[PDB]
Amino acid sequence: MELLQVLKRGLQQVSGHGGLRGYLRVLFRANDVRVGTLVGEDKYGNKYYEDNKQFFGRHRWVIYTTEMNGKNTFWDVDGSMVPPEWHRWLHCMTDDP
Amino acid sequence: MWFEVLPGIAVMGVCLFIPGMATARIHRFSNGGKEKRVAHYPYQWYLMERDRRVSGVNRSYVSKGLENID
Amino acid sequence: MFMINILMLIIPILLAVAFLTLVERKVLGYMQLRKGPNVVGPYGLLQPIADAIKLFIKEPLRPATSSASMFILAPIMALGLALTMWIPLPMPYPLINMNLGVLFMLAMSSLAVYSILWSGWASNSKYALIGALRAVAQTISYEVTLAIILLSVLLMSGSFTLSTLITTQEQMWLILPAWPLAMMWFISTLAETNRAPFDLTEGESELVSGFNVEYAAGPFALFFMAEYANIIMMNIFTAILFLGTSHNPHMPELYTINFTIKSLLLTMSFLWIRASYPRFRYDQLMHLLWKNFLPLTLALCMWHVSLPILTSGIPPQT
Amino acid sequence: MNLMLALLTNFTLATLLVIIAFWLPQLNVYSEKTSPYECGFDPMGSARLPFSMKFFLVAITFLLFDLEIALLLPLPWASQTANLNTMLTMALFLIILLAVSLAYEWTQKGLEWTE
Amino acid sequence: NLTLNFGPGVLRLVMELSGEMVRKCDPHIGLLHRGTEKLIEYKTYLQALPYFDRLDYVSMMCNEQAYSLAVEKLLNIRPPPRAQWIRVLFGEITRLLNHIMAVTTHALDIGAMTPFFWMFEEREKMFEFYERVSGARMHAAYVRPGGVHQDLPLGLMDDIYEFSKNFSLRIDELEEMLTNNRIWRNRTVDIGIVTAEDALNYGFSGVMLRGSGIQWDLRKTQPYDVYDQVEFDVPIGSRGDCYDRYLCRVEEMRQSIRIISQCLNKMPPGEIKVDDAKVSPPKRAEMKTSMESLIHHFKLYTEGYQVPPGATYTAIEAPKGEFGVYLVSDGSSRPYRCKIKAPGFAHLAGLDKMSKGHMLADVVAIIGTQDIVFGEVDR
Amino acid sequence: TYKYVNLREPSMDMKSVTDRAAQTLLWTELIRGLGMTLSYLFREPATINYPFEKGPLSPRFRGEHALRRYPSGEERCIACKLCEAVCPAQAITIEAEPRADGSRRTTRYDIDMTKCIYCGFCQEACPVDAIVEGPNFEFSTETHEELLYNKEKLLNNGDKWEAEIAANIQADYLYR
Amino acid sequence: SRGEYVVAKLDDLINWARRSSLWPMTFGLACCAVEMMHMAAPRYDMDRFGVVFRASPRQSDVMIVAGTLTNKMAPALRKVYDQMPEPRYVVSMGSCANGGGYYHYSYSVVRGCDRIVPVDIYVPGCPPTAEALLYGILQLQKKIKREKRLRIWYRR
């Protein structure tokens, strides 16, 4: 029965991203298909999530925007795209977004 | 997680299944839907050649039954 | 139609080798509390393709003072023989149905030692010649046991035909009456294919270099391809020999599915072992063969020559 | 013929993968490259590897053990004879002599790697 | 015979081989010689502190402690008790960092590659304790003559307790892979035997002494800081070989959890650097309101405190063995001479003797069992 | 106090001897080491998803340098050169002169980021919290010349990381 | 066709392979090498980006100079660099290999490995965090992705 529950989380992740297209978009951009709570969004398009069921280190992540200052960042993401005010939250230097 | 290793195994498993399936299917295609004849000893080869002379056509996998004896 | 059959053997073999590298890198990682390739393609399914293209558009550096003819011969012989050992395998129907299939496998396997010797001879390094003479000495030593263990099993099967091992094991696997041989056979295949803990030349990196450490680019990829094809081939041999599958002439696909599953579980046991044990010293793996395995294999060869006679269980010649 | 086709294809393909390996890429060679790897240092002598006697003994021992195996290969066929008492005696005689041969190299320090 | 050249820290072994055996082993060092002992003569005492994080770069805070004890001895001052308990706490978290590196790299050299990865997720968590007290994962520069730089942040001892409560199981998994493994015992038992009298005469220290049965540990014979207010046992070997020393290092990692368990419960309150503003800088909030505290902050960070003239050899039980500094002073703000006694320098000098009558594959096992880092051998 | 790691004598009763013979011939301890690597296969891996996840840091982290300002926009640095005197790697160069308004400010302020040992002594010595090490650790470059910062480069870092730098100082200045 | 289109797509393919299968050859020289090991440890797992843990000079594509380069060691480093098959990139890790670092003024230290070999990425720090080195490697992959080897050949 618990095994049957596993295959239901793996299905509701496809819906958690808005369907099959969104599921594939985040699979080919971030290599990860988890779904977490949305903490906020920044002026450049970055979206930040969290999931406290995950172990320390994987409990916060950012899905980078596809455009930033005129650069097509659909594939070319980079850790320096995180703005400072969110840079403190992502690196777990504070608990307050 | 550990099940993210299966997709690599599934691809590798299929690649090892194809050679055995293709050989099985190609043998039946070329021998009228039957197994290929195994002739490891001369007596088996003498019967295969005789089958080739009995079918009329030069195919040792064409079998003539009681209909051919009158 | 036969020429189509060859291409349905060679091409799927290489694809299996290319994706055995991914499976090895991910099974190793998860036993090490990490993931492995998951970026290049979904779950790293494109990682094998990236490596192959990378190696074949690199500079194929051949040393100036190297014997060019032998430098090229070694990788050709290694890969050529690797694919030749797949033609008689009954999966369940061989491409070439040999009456002496088992004996043909031994002969081609013993020829592969030349690729190791030519590679170390043609490089003019003497850092790679010592590794070659060490690898050559390890491979010839551990094929004495393979020839005797294989002979002992054929005394319950009755012939050299590989398709007959499917009939010997039509009621029961041979691993039950021959697990002493299976244990020594399994470790012998590790020592033949230079796998850990018997990998003193491929990647020892203990004040010792490999025999093909002078190769680069495409020529290196050919040594690697042959090495991994033989790994898969040796575990297919172990499945047919000791874990035989049942053959239904009307559903040959059932044999292939079950036969493939056992071959994968045996190939994943080469990755499992590499992650668990340290590597032997050179003298210690020589003492393992000459002082432990060979004395027991000779005793068990005497035992398996007289057991059929003393129980009235001699198999049929044909 | 089916066997000669299989061998020709196996070695023909392996040769194509070598020509495309030595011709497709873009080469650039000079003196420092195309030298023996060593370990980042210069060679310490213009002499080849000294001959080692112990490596020669393993090779010769394997050859003589290999030849004794050649006589053991037809045992599967030999168990079908009517002279089983004769056949079984010579089978064990050969394997025992192969053991006596090993028992000699062992007790004369032929299987040792310490100088 | 076959004179080969092995190597490319980085070592250059020039070994003479007669077959598999090793005839003479000649270590050529200096591939990582940087002139540290001459650069310290141009620095003040505070400016020379980061140089000691880079000698044995697996045991950073133990090297710092030895230098502070020497300067504190020539300064004739005493760090406060809370500083001392912090230094024992982080002196033993550092012993765990070194033994994991020393045991799993030793195993990595001889083919065992999996334990390296298990215990480097334990080093990674300990690096977060370094980062949370000093801001740097490796080269903290946190222990200074007079005490420590800053106090522990609130909520750090909880995470050291949570970590140390699971670390005994991690060792047990490591011992499952190695201790009873026949392949691992054949590589270590009766390899690199050293007699007690040879160990003493060759200048060995640490496990190289205790693997041979000598009962000597500076934490118990010449205690420093508060090592006489904590209880631990000293592992002792019997064979004197690589296997016994390997066990000695796995048992020390167990005795450090014992010591850490006590440093957490017995941590006292108070200041974390000596209340003497001519040696340790004042608090920043009094540097900005007191006239004297601005004068001393100015002088301590430009000229530095003056050490009275004298010379001292001060040694501690570093994870790799006795680590000491012979520090000469002429009365000024800069040391006149700083000889660094690196334990690996004496051990690597005994490689040739320990390798007598062994194969070439045992020389790798011998170098690992001495736990050689060429930051300190070459300085 | 001491303890013996390896001072044991195996028992020589036929029960124990047979146990060791079974171990030698049946590879029991080897097959017990396979179990430990099988269990790790079924544990969740410890890998984070970089660059979409970042390893935890702390307010005290020593990263890239930055010159700060007062809330009014005036520069905090008053060319005292304490940071230049204590830098153990001699990676700071400073020149100064009276400004047009008569204030004490710098004309040259260089940090050679390939000499710097990223030690923190410059932010300890500074009496006005002008030079700090922000939390940035992702500033690698394709040329050596790009890692030789001058005053213009350092003030841009301060004007770029002040939202985060000010917060980190707030969370740690009571420990200093 | 236009010819340019085919060359543009072939450039993408070969660039993709080269940046997706980087095999480094670590010259672990000093403390910076411990952080390089922590980039292979479970938390970061550079093997997942296609970066194998270790290789030999003949099968390596990128050299990571991580540590102080002494005068006694410089000739050894150059000979290993010359024997790497091309394309070959160099990553300089840490202050010691960048410009000499703490030992810049020493009599026995080479002031930056760039005096001996051409460098592609300079990773700052003493030592750089295992995340900084990972950021440096990913920056090198983008640099390979921008290469235009075949376009420039077509316009020769």
Ligand code: SF4
């Ligand atoms: S961090 Fe240390 S080395 Fe770097 S500039 Fe500041 S004082 Fe100098």
Ligand code: SF4
């Ligand atoms: S210590 Fe501060 S105020 Fe003085 S020169 Fe340096 S940055 Fe400016």
Ligand code: SF4
């Ligand atoms: S840059 Fe720093 S950490 Fe790296 S080798 Fe030099 S001193 Fe050590």
